[PDB]
Every structure is written in structure tokens, then in C-alpha cells.
Amino acid sequence: ALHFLDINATEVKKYPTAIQDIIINRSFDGMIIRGVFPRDTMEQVARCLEEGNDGGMKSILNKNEEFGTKVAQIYGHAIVGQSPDLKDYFASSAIFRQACRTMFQGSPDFEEQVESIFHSLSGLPVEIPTGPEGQTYTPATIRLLLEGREIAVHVGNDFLLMPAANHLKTLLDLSDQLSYFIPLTVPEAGGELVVYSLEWNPQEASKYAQMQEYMDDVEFKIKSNQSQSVAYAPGPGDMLLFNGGRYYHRVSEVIGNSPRRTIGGFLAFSKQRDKIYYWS
Numbered sequence: 459a460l461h462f463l464d465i466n467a468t469e470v471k472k473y474p475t476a477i478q479d480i481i482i483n484r485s486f487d488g489m490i491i492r493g494v495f496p497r498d499t500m501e502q503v504a505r506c507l508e509e510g511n512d513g514g515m516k517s518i519l520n521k522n523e524e525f526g527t528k529v530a531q532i533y534g535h536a537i538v539g540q541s542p543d544l545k546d547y548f549a550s551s552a553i554f555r556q557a558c559r560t561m562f563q564g565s566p567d568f569e570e571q572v573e574s575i576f577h578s579l580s581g582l583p584v585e586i587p588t589g590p591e592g593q594t595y596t597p598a599t600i601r602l603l604l605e606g607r608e609i610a611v612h613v614g615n616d617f618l619l620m621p622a623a624n625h626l627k628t629l630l631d632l633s634d635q636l637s638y639f640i641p642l643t644v645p646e647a648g649g650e651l652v653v654y655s656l657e658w659n660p661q662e663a664s665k666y667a668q669m670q671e672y673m674d675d676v677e678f679k680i681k682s683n684q685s686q687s688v689a690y691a692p693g694p695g696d697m698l699l700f701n702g703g704r705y706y707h708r709v710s711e712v713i714g715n716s717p718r719r720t721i722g723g724f725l726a727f728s729k730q731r732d733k734i735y736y737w738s
């Protein structure tokens with residue numbers, strides 16, 4: 459039901475309004491972009507993490523043990539669930555950027571390459587957002603899914619309703635936010651991005667007595683009947699760029715000894731629509 463383009467990284471400049479067309483015009487819902495990073499680069503970065511020679515990335519690993527099976531471990535603080543002051547977020551974000559820059563060894567640089575893609579798909583300048591007093595946001599977090607683990611169903615636009623987003627809302631236009639991620643390592647089986655046709659609907663959610671009741675309905679609505687879905691398994695160095703702000707989605711259980719490792723985040727238009735911000 460959902461329409462995705464499947465293109466190679468070298469063809470991106472032939473789609474100079476792809477981000478506009480996904481968010482504003484809504485003519486299609488996502489993109490696989492093949493070979494944004496070389497496989498050598500992906501394996502180099504995977505080894506750094508595995509070895510511990512990771513530019514200090516393991517010093518900002520959040521295991522999320524208090525939460526259950528339905529959640530990845532995350533290198534760097536994800537903005538989702540943070541307090542609106544973002545002090546811990548800004549500290550870990552500064553560490554992430556430096557550590558990630560070192561691991562990629564400018565071959566190519568993660569930030570430069572990801573920004574190159576987003577520029578090519580929009581014709582606009584691209585920036586990592588900056589805090590109230592100049593503090594850097596993080597462009598991405600690295601998500602680690604071990605065997606048996608998954609990422610529970612969720613929708614991206616709920617972020618706008620969180621305290622964490624109070625600063626970003628001053629900078630962002632309130633159109634849909636996209637999700638992006640590149641696998642560093644893929645598992646033997648499972649760990650697929652499942653995108654459903656069930657859409658974000660805060661109007662419906664407020665009619666319930668609380669969000670607890672609304673997500674319980676959404677969960678039973680999605681498993682498994684009244685919603686079409688599509689699954690994706692990008693390879694190492696492929697970007698999956700899609701409207702996760704609008705569409706409910708999840709990552710299926712990882713099967714096998716090899717963990718799923720992705721580097722990713724989100725993007726959206728600036729208030730003025732003359733710029734793209736990306737972050738995690």
C-alpha cells in the first residue's frame with residue numbers, strides 16, 4: 459500500500475524535491491538509497507564499536523535495562539524521553555559527534571555524507587540543530603539490537619507532544635518529520651523495518667481517557683487485522699528514508715548471533731522552509 463522508491467546513492471540529484479514530495483505533497487512515503495556508505499566504511503565502523511576503539515562511543519551507551527525486550531540499546535541520548543532542559547542530551551551529543559567523526563575517518567565523514575544526501579533530495583541547506591545557548595544536538599544515535607530484541611510500534615509525530623521537543627518546536631515547521639537510518643551491520647534474519655498504513659491521529663487520541671488506552675487500541679488494531687504493512691531490510695550502508703512521523707512502524711525481532719546495528723535519526727523542515735534540520 460505504501461509507495462517507496464528504490465534508488466542508488468549516485469542517482470539522488472535526479473530527485474531534488476523528494477523530501478518536499480514526501481512531507482508536503484505526500485505523493486510517496488519513503489526511499490531506499492543504496493550504497494550511501496561503502497561496505498568497507500560500514501565494517502570499519504562496526505569493528506571500532508566491537509573492539510572498543512570507538513572514539514569514546516561506549517562511554518555514552520544507554521543499555522535501557524529498566525525497559526524490556528521491545529527496545530534497542532542506544533549510543534548517545536536519543537532526544538525522545540529527555541527532560542526539556544536537554545543538558546544530559548547536549549553533553550552526550552557533543553561526545554557522539556566527535557566519536558562518530560573519528561570512527562568514520564572521513565571516508566566518507568558521516569555528517570558530510572548524510573548532509574550531502576539530504577541536500578541532493580531537497581535543494582536546501584542542511585544543518586544539525588543548535589540549542590538555546592548554542593549547544594549542539596546530535597545528528598544521529600547508534601541503535602543496537604541483540605538476538606530476541608525488537609523496537610516496539612510507534613509513530614514519530616508523537617515527539618512534538620513530548621517535553622523534550624519544546625526547543626525544537628521553536629525551530630521546526632510542524633509538518634511531518636521523516637526518519638532515516640543506515641545499517642552498520644545486519645542480522646542473519648529478522649530486524650526488518652515494518653511500516654504500517656495506520657496514521658498518526660492526535661485528535662482520536664485525545665478522545666480517550668489517557669494515552670495508555672489509545673496505544674492499547676493501536677497495538678490491538680495493528681496485531682493483526684485492520685492495517686496494511688510493508689517490510690524492509692536495507693543492507694549495510696543503505697539509507698532507509700521514510701515518513702515515520704506519519705506512519706506507525708516498528709523493527710521486528712532480531713534472529714541469530716549477529717546483532718543489528720543502525721545509525722540514524724530524523725529530519726524536518728525549518729520554520730521558514732528554507733532549510734532542513736536533522737537530529738536524533
Ligand SMILES: [C-]#[N+][C@@H]1[C@@H]2c3c([nH]c4ccccc34)C(C)(C)[C@H]2CC[C@@]1(C)CC
Nearest residue numbers: 522525529530536538539601609610612
Ligand atoms: C529504542 N529506541 C528509541 C525509542 C524508544 C522507544 N522506547 C524507548 C524507551 C527508552 C529509550 C528509548 C526508547 C521507542 C519504542 C519509542 C523507540 C523509537 C525509536 C528509537 C530507536 C529512537 C527514538
Ligand SMILES: O=C(O)CCC(=O)C(=O)O
Nearest residue numbers: 601637638639702720722
Ligand atoms: O532501526 C532504527 O535505527 C530505527 C528504526 C525506527 O524506528 C525509525 O527509523 O524511526
Ligand SMILES: [Cl-]
Nearest residue numbers: 613614637702
Ligand atoms: Cl519515529
Ligand SMILES: [Fe+2]
Nearest residue numbers: 612614637702
Ligand atoms: Fe521510529
